[PDB]
Write a protein that binds this ligand. Structure first.
Ligand SMILES: *[C@@H]1O[C@H](CO)[C@@H](O)[C@H](O)[C@H]1NC(C)=O
Ligand SMILES: [Cu+2]
Length: 235
């Protein structure tokens, strides 16, 4: 169970974004129903009043939390990958629009899942803003907790992969648009019960065999990290 508090841009805290520039759900409950509209931007997808200004090449950092800011972030048990997607805001996240900017499942050297390192990073993971058209976008951060993912939700609704999905309203101001935004996958729709990385047993299967759900990261992605950028105790 985890939620986004806000974002940072180039290491500058944009402030509490909950229901302001994040389309925040009412609580930190996972989405599990792969067919639900809740997969798009979680259970309360609506336009919120603010959209954070960035430029292409900026570092945009999502900051997650559990109950309060800069707490335990997410239960240790919730091992799994992290992805970030982007879509034009005009889409409202409908259609084949979600382009993947970031994927991290499991770091072989460190022996740590993305979620494990997210905790260590005080809830913070980043993407570099791509050189798409200036305009309004949705950045959809997605944490998949796999601790009950050996079952399918569709078969057993008490279990299943858990999706912690947060859509941030971001406005790209300066960009040369050298990498126009390509089509993307639909949410709901890109993940089905037979998609790799939806059903997995993290207890018996080595993490080095885990394949995260497609799609692949777009060649226009400028990178990202799971790493603390800013200190919530100070700003
Ligand atoms: C999953 O969501 C679909 C689409 O909204 C809905 O029809 C279906 O009943 C849901 N399944 C469960 C068990 O909620
Ligand atoms: Cu949880």
């Amino acid at each position: 169970h985890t939620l986004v508090w806000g974002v940072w841009v180039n290491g500058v805290d944009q402030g509490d974004g909950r229901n302001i520039y994040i389309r925040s759900p009412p609580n930190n409950n996972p989405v599990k129903n792969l067919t639900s509209p809740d997969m798009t931007c979680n259970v309360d997808n609506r336009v919120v009043p603010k959209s954070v200004p960035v430029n292409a090449g900026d570092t945009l950092t999502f900051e997650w939390y559990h109950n309060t800011r800069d707490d335990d972030i997410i239960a240790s048990s919730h091992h799994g990958p992290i992805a970030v997607y982007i879509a034009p805001a005009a889409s409202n996240g409908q259609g084949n629009v979600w382009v993947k900017l970031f994927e991290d499942a499991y770091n072989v050297t460190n022996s740590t899942w993305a979620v494990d390192r997210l905790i260590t990073a005080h809830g913070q993971h980043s993407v570099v803003v791509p050189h798409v058209a200036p305009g309004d976008y949705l950045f959809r951060a997605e944490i998949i907790a796999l601790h009950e993912a050996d079952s399918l939700y569709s078969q057993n609704p008490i279990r299943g992969a858990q999706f912690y999905i947060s859509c941030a309203q971001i406005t790209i101001n300066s960009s040369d648009d050298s990498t126009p935004l390509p089509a993307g996958v639909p949410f709901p729709g890109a993940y089905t019960d037979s998609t790799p990385g939806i059903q997995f047993n993290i207890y018996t299967t080595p993490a080095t065999s885990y394949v995260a759900p497609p799609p692949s990261v777009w060649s226009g992605a400028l990178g990202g990290s799971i790493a603390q950028v800013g200190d919530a105790s100070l700003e």
